[PDB]
């Protein structure tokens, strides 16, 4: 109630306070509890191999230098008071570009407690790297992590833990990625050893499963229909040289236009994807179909019936092996 | 243990400290040891001729003004104390855009030692220029360097060396470029002379080898199959004017669509790449194949047999010369 009394209490706390020294300097390491409330996962980029995450990052720790008596309330102070207090040097090891929202002010919260407990909240948008195994693309499952670590303080000076155990991270169900579904999330606590010493580590990982529905309609269906369309040449009479030859190449031309456009959406990985094998496989079938008429024309100037039996069978065999291998 | 005792020691060190004056001002040059821990090489851009590097940049030097006694510990201070200390004016000569990560704080470390040794660490993401010789593209090998130099202090005032010799740079094995493989890295120390004097220089260079697997499947295979597909016209009977003419142009059309799309991914270099020679070479073969039927049609209203022998042979000769020249 008495603002002057509160003002004197706060001024006393900051009087002689050294931001350069951590709480319990020279003593036991200070335990910092962290909880994350996920706001959204805006983007998942295969070309850049990273994802963008927006979250409410909160840290809990005790600073005896900030303990106050006589005020039975939790003091919610202006975010500018954080510049006069010690905060953990928490950083994200796998991030590529991060910032703190500053509209209309810095999205920062400082809440003190009578025993010296400090609640420090930040709203952070971060772009974190996530190496992706695209061998089974687009039927792949990805494990994107967020590594949380202290930059300068070793385990002798600071310690991290998930406040609330497995409930430390909330809002995962709110994530709505158009291309991915959040299968599971995990919380991991461990110690990482470097040349400068051992540092505490907290890891938040998401298992992402790509949605196959878009690629089935956009890519597989046009390729299947063109391959079936190439088999129409077998029904056509052998004397229709203009018709059958035009059918073979235009199907080949159709495959090229589909093949060129599809591969523009992905990075230059040297290994064979599931989509890569399918596009090239279809391009071979239409290529062989046109070759099939070449042998026909040369011999006549039987093979057709053999091809009519084999080509649908081989393509069905190719699909059966393909889908079993990746599903 | 005694925070007040530590506070007095630190305040004494910064009392009268002049950041404008380097250690041992007017005396022997201060030796600065540097070690780099690579975090990742995010991108390698041929169009922009640059690469993006994320690393932990650390500097080691001795400042007798910061020597303290009575405290047998290495003081890890808040990163904001770096603003009150002298640091080398280290800059990257070949960088295009660099920044220091600042989430949740500036990724900066200051660690003092009783003898005055200062450890100064920064997490830096830098985009450094790398001129690329694309004559042998995409079978080329690139040497991308990172030039480290003092901006204002000459060799009379400061000196750089790799702390740890050939082990000064770590984490190279962690680099996972989808398009490149890290063949080797080298550390070079030398002195560079300018109009304003001679300056110390440290160079970190990576030899990158482009992965050929992606381009073989995406580019070479479609071109080879189309060129083989053009030879199908030779099997076709000469009276099938509609069939053979349609075959020639559609193969030419297919080459144009492939050729236009491929060249969009590269800068406008005036010299002939390996891929450039191959695409134009294939476009000539399909062009000559259609010309081959023109002479046939005119004469008949033998050449076919000669072409059936020559065209596969010439294309095989073209491939044999091409691959031997670049591999």
């Amino acid at each position, epitope marked *: 109630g008495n603002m002057s009394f509160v003002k004197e209490t706060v001024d006393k706390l900051l009087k002689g306070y050294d931001i350069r020294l951590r709480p319990d300097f020279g003593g036991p390491p200070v335990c910092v509890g962290m909880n994350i409330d996920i706001a959204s996962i805006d983007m998942v980029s295969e070309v850049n191999m990273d994802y963008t995450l927006t979250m409410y990052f909160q840290q809990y720790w005790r600073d005896k230098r900030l303990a106050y008596s006589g005020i039975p309330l939790n003091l919610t102070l202006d975010n500018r008071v954080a510049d006069q207090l010690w905060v953990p040097d928490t950083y994200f090891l796998n991030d590529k570009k991060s910032f703190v929202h500053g509209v209309t002010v810095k999205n920062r919260m400082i809440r003190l407690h009578p025993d010296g407990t400090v609640l420090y909240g930040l709203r952070i948008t971060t772009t974190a790297a996530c190496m992706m195994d695209l061998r089974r693309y687009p039927l792949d499952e990805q494990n994107c992590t967020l590594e949380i670590e202290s930059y300068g303080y070793t385990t002798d000076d600071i310690e991290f833990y998930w406040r609330g155990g497995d409930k430390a991270v909330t809002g995962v169900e709110r994530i709505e990625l158009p291309q991915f579904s959040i299968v599971e999330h995990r919380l991991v606590s461990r110690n990482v050893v470097f040349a400068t010493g051992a540092y505490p580590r907290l890891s938040l990982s998401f298992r992402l499963k790509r949605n196959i529905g878009y690629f089935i309609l956009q890519t597989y269906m046009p390729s299947i229909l063109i391959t079936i369309l190439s088999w129409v040449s077998f029904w056509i009479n052998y004397d229709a040289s203009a018709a059958r030859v035009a059918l073979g190449i235009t199907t080949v031309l159709t495959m090229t236009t589909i093949n060129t456009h599809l591969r523009e959406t992905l990075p230059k990985i040297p290994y064979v994807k599931a989509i890569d094998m399918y596009l090239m496989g279809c391009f071979v079938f239409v290529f062989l179909a046109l070759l099939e008429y070449a042998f026909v024309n040369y011999i006549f100037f039987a093979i057709d019936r053999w091809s009519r039996i084999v080509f649908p069978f081989t393509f069905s065999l190719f699909n059966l092996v393909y889908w079993l291998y990746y599903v | 243990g005694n925070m007040s005792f530590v506070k007095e020691t630190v305040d004494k060190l910064l009392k009268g400290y002049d950041i404008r004056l380097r250690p041992d001002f007017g005396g022997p040059p201060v030796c600065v040891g540097m070690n780099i821990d690579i975090a990742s090489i995010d991108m390698v851009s041929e169009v922009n001729m640059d690469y993006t590097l994320t690393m932990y940049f650390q500097q080691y030097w001795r400042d007798k003004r910061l020597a303290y006694s009575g405290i047998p510990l290495n003081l890890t201070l808040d990163n904001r104390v770096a603003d009150q200390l002298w640091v080398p004016d280290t800059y990257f000569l070949n960088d295009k855009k660099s920044f220091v990560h600042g989430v949740t704080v500036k990724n900066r470390m200051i660690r003092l030692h009783p003898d005055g040794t200062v450890l100064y660490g920064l997490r830096i993401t830098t985009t450094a220029a790398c001129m690329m010789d694309l004559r042998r593209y995409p079978l080329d090998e690139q040497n991308c360097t990172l030039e480290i130099e003092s901006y204002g202090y000459t060799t009379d005032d400061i000196e750089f060396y790799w702390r740890g010799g050939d082990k000064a740079v770590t984490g190279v*094995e962690r680099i996972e470029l989808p398009q490149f493989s890290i063949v080797e890295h080298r550390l070079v120390s030398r002195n560079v002379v300018f109009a304003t004097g001679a300056y110390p220089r440290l160079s970190l260079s990576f030899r990158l080898k482009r992965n050929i697997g992606y381009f073989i499947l995406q580019t070479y295979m479609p071109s080879i199959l189309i060129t083989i597909l053009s030879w199908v016209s030779f099997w076709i009977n000469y009276d099938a004017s509609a069939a053979r003419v349609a075959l020639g142009i559609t193969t030419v059309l297919t080459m144009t669509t492939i050729n236009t799309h491929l060249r969009e991914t590269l800068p406008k270099i005036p010299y002939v790449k390996a891929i450039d020679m191959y695409l134009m070479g294939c476009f000539v073969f399909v062009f000559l194949a259609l010309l081959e039927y023109a002479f046939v049609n005119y004469i008949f209203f033998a050449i076919d047999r000669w072409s059936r022998i020559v065209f596969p042979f010439t294309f095989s000769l073209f491939n044999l010369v091409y691959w031997l020249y670049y591999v």
Partner: nanobody
Amino acid sequence: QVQLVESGGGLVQGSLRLSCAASGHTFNYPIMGWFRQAPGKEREFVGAISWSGGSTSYADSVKDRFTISRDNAKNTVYLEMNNLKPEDTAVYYCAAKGRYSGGLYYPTNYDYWGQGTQVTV
């Protein structure tokens, strides 16, 4: 989950090739390190290689004598040991390391370990 089995280590007095087979989510653990534990001594680092890329790193004691190669298609890491010395009598282990597990030289940073072959020279 990654399962590691190493084989190819026998008793000799010589060139040896130790192979470490991997299975599971090997992509999440791209770095493979070789460790040996002499009796009465802590486990010692030998060499750490990456599944992808192929860049290598070796200890000073076994530099230019032990070479390691890997192939993702075979999903196996091969350690070739040449010019064997009596100090190389230890249980050789194969370990997998996470992408952001930190330093290579520290066995604690490694999560999945092999059984360990006993080699005496």
